[PDB]
Structures are given as structure tokens and as C-alpha cells.
Amino acid sequence: GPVPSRARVYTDVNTHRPREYWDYESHVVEWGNQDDYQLVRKLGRGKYSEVFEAINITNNEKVVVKILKPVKKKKIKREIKILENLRGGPNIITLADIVKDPVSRTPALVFEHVNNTDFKQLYQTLTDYDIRFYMYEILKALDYCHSMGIMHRDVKPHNVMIDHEHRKLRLIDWGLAEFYHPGQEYNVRVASRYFKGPELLVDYQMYDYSLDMWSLGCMLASMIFRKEPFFHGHDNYDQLVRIAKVLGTEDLYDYIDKYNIELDPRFNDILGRHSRKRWERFVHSENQHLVSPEALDFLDKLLRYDHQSRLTAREAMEHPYFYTVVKD
Ligand SMILES: COc1cc(/C=C(\C#N)C(=O)Nc2nnc(C(C)(C)C)s2)ccc1O
């Protein structure tokens, strides 16, 4: 069988919390007044929700309303409980209210309003300094939620809201997030394809917070090299091949051998043999102003096959890449 694995940090946060903290199936939702919120416009529809801009008519302030699609009361209560546990943490989107939508017959989560610029256009204008700054802000959110026993499991540009005018960042969509319990096996069908960690792609279920750090590394690579997404697989198998063309196949075999994992035999005809590459080959005249020795070393220390070898969020915040970021 597979060799077990444990997070190297925040390992026992939930076992020493009171049961109510992580036992989300027993959570009792405190419902607000649905008539407080007037929907203004539909902003988007996801796999699991529709998102609206709205007005809170008790203060005439704009809010965002996420009306959940019908899913298991378990998955709904999980997201609600995680948002309440994390509320007020650095750069965590603030759940302001929860109401029963009378049309959908599902909960509608009310969030603080973030005046966001879409990552498609925003990523075209970010400077070297901008990228370091916003990476540091994401790390504050990830260290916070990891320190609170929670992994996000869906870190990607779409879930990082940035109000660039006020340099304000919020990590959103906690609908895939989970509580970390040592030795628990988790669903590997999380995260968007381009941001899935090697652990998901080789079907290793005993993963942890370090999954988020791979995803973050994928975002960093797309930003400093101006190639979004960086690992651009056509499916989940080709996704691992794309990673192995950069990190090399010998270290992939070291990874799966360490955890006594077996690759899907369908890789025998697609994976090939690939050397590990040096990150400088992705540097060119149109991205070099975003690349530094510190950026490449930081990236290299996030994008490890072995989830146990990646920088933690707190370690990442100590990295020289952030020395130039002005600290508040
Ligand atoms: C999909 O889960 C979530 C989504 C959100 C929020 C948004 C999304 N998605 C959001 O605020 N999207 C916007 N798109 N344009 C905006 C203007 C600045 C034009 C008003 S806001 C918050 C918490 C969640 O859990």
C-alpha cells in the first residue's frame, strides 16, 4: 500500500480545537434577513454557484451575493463553517451574512464587495514589484488558513480578487476547502487542472496544506514568465506529462517511489524520459523584467513533486524574493 504522510506544520491544529470548530456537519446556521439584499446584476455562474452584485439596503453599501447550487448539505455546511472560522483573517474574504434564497431554495452567502480587475487584463500590467507584493498578500491568507487547520484546495487566479487601486487582495471561493486531519485521505478531484499538484495527478490521497503551495507556484510561474497557464495540459494525464517535461521524469519516479505509489499504466506510452530543466530557459526579452535570481529560487522551492519538500507559507514569507516588498 501507499506510505502515509503528515503535514510538516500545523499538523495537530484541529485535534486540539474543540469539536465544534471542525465538526461542520453539526454546525447550526444563523440566518439573516433575505429582504436586506437587493440583487443588481448577475456577475457569473460557476460549477457550484451563481454570483450577483447586490445592495445591502440597511446601509446602501454594495455587496456580493453567492447563491449556491443544490449540493450536499455537507458541502454547503463545510464552506459556511470554514468561512466563519476564518472570518477576519488577513486577506480572507469576509462572509457578511447568510440568507435563505426563496427562489433557489438554497443558502445565499453575502460577502464583502471587492472592486476587482479581471486577472486576464490585470496580469498584463503587473510589475515586478506588484507581483512580489501580491504574492506576499496571498501568502498571508494561506499561512492564516493553514494555521487554522484549513487547506483551500482551489488556489488559482480566478479565486484571488484584487482591487488594484487600493492594493487590496482577497482569497475567495472556499467551496472546495477542507479541514486537515493527520492521516485523513482526501478526494483528489479538487483544484483546476492547471493548478493540480502532482499528488492529485498520481492519485495520492493523504495530502495536506502543501497542495496550495504547488498551486501558488503555478500562479507565480505564469506571472513571472508571462505564460498563463504555465503547465497547460489538455487533460489530467497530459497535465502530469507537462510537469515532467520541466521537473524531469527521474524525480517523478523518486517521488512516487518514496510513497510506494504506482503510476497509472496509461503513462507508459505518453510519459517519455525527460531531464530536469533549469528555469532560465523560460526567460526571454518580454518577461526578463519580471525575473530575478530570487524569483527563480523561490519558484524552484514551491514547485517540488514531493509535497513534503515544498516551502510552507511561513517559510515562503521569509524568502529573499520579498526583501524588496515594503512591510507594513
Ligand atoms: C465564487 O465564489 C465566491 C465569489 C466571490 C466574489 C466574486 C466572484 N466570482 C466577485 O466579487 N466577482 C466580481 N466580478 N466583478 C465584480 C465588480 C468589481 C465588477 C463588482 S465583483 C466571493 C466569495 C466566493 O466564495
Swiss-Prot record:
Keyword annotations from UniProtKB, A to Z: Apoptosis, ATP-binding, Biological rhythms, Cell cycle, Disease variant, Intellectual disability, Kinase, Nucleotide-binding, Nucleus, Phosphoprotein, Serine/threonine-protein kinase, Transcription, Transcription regulation, Transferase, Wnt signaling pathway
Full-sequence portion shown in this chain: 3 to 330 of 391
Principal subcellular localisation of the protein: nucleus
Enzyme Commission no: 2.7.11.1
Span of domain Protein kinase: 37-322
Organism of derivation: Homo sapiens
Disease named in the record: Okur-Chung neurodevelopmental syndrome: An autosomal dominant neurodevelopmental disorder characterized by developmental delay, intellectual disability, behavioral problems, hypotonia, speech problems, microcephaly, pachygyria and variable dysmorphic features.
Protein name, UniProt field: Casein kinase II subunit alpha
Complexes and interactors: Heterotetramer composed of two catalytic subunits (alpha chain and/or alpha' chain) and two regulatory subunits (beta chains). The tetramer can exist as a combination of 2 alpha/2 beta, 2 alpha'/2 beta or 1 alpha/1 alpha'/2 beta subunits. Also part of a CK2-SPT16-SSRP1 complex composed of SSRP1, SUPT16H, CSNK2A1, CSNK2A2 and CSNK2B, which forms following UV irradiation. Interacts with RNPS1. Interacts with SNAI1. Interacts with PML (isoform PML-12). Interacts with CCAR2. Interacts with HIRIP3.
Family: Belongs to the protein kinase superfamily. Ser/Thr protein kinase family. CK2 subfamily.
Lineage: Eukaryota, Metazoa, Chordata, Craniata, Vertebrata
Recorded catalytic activity of this chain's protein: L-seryl-[protein] + ATP = O-phospho-L-seryl-[protein] + ADP + H(+); L-threonyl-[protein] + ATP = O-phospho-L-threonyl-[protein] + ADP + H(+)
One Gene Ontology biological process: negative regulation of double-strand break repair via homologous recombination
Residues at the catalytic site: 154 (proton acceptor)
Compartment(s) of residence: Nucleus
Tissues of expression: Expressed in gastric carcinoma tissue and the expression gradually increases with the progression of the carcinoma (at protein level).
UniProt activity-regulation remark: Constitutively active protein kinase whose activity is not directly affected by phosphorylation. Seems to be regulated by level of expression and localization.
Enzyme class, UniProt record, top EC level: transferase
UniProt modification remark: Phosphorylation does not directly affect casein kinase 2 activity, but may contribute to its regulation by forming binding sites for interacting proteins and/or targeting it to different compartments.
GO cellular component, one term: plasma membrane
Extra remark: Can use both ATP and GTP as phosphoryl donors. Phosphorylation by casein kinase 2 has been estimated to represent up to one quarter of the eukaryotic phosphoproteome. Casein kinase 2 has been found to be increased at protein level and up-regulated at the level of enzyme activity in the majority of cancers. However, elevated levels of casein kinase 2 are present in certain normal organs such as brain and testes.
